[PDB]
Amino acid sequence: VGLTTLFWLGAIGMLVGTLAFAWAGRRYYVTLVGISGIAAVAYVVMALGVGWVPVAERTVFAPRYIDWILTTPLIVYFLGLLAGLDSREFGIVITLNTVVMLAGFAGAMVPGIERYALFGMGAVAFLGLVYYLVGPMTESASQRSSGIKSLYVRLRNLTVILWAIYPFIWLLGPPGVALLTPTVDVALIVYLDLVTKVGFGFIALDAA
Numbered sequence: 479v480g481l482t483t484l485f486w487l488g489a490i491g492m493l494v495g496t497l498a499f500a501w502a503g504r505r506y507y508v509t510l511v512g513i514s515g516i517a518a519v520a521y522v523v524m525a526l527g528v529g530w531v532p533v534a535e536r537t538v539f540a541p542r543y544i545d546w547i548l549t550t551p552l553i554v555y556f557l558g559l560l561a562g563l564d565s566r567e568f569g570i571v572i573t574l575n576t577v578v579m580l581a582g583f584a585g586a587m588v589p590g591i592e593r594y595a596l597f598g599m600g601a602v603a604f605l606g607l608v609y610y611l612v613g614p615m616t617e618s619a620s621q622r623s624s625g626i627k628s629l630y631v632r633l634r635n636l637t638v639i640l641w642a643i644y645p646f647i648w649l650l651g652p653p654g655v656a657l658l659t660p661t662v663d664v665a666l667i668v669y670l671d672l673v674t675k676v677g678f679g680f681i682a683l684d685a686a
């Protein structure tokens with residue numbers, strides 16, 4: 479099982495999700511198409527061997543971080559619509575999200591230990607993002623129908639629990655202490671990407 483095989487698997491999974499969401503679809507459905515559609519492209523590019531950047535003694539996958547930077551704010555946007563956020567609360571959480579994603583991208587691309595300083599900053603901003611999901615956004619979602627509130631809580635917990643695993647996979651993998659091997663590290667992230675995007679989406683379809 480090679481890296482390319484794992485990338486192709488993620489590509490196929492994202493594509494199936496993309497077509498499923500497009501068929502079922504307006505704002506929510508269009509967002510889900512963007513979430514998995516963008517990831518599909520990133521995985522194909524990586525499957526073709528494009529964007530594998532050598533850094534010191536590790537290999538960094540640049541399309542992964544471009545993907546995350548564009549798709550994770552769309553996931554937060556989806557959750558913000560469910561919770562009924564005003565346009566100002568959106569700005570805070572999307573700003574916090576972007577800090578996490580940019581810090582990870584920069585830390586991965588830096589060869590020296592300064593990269594752990596960048597990782598720490600993303601961790602701090604992530605804790606602030608979790609606070610907004612579990613607190614203010616949950617208060618806000620409470621004002622909606624019982625079924626919408628229930629859907630928000632289920633997507634929120636899926637999101638919080640799984641997103642919290644990524645920093646550990648990153649740190650234990652090549653970008654960090656380089657303990658886990660690239661193949662295992664990639665396999666774990668392909669699984670998480672598929673669940674936090676396509677699984678996320680199908681839980682929404684089921685409730686609709």
Ligand SMILES: *C/C=C(C)/C=C/C=C(C)/C=C/C1=C(C)CCCC1(C)C
Pocket residue numbers: 517546549550578579581582583597600601604641642644645648671674675
């Ligand atoms: C579809 C892709 C998803 C949901 C990716 C999620 C990624 C994260 C939650 C990553 C978080 C990170 C930290 C909290 C600290 C810095 C390193 C990251 C980017 C792995």
Ligand SMILES: [Cl-]
Pocket residue numbers: 537538539542586653
């Ligand atoms: Cl990476």
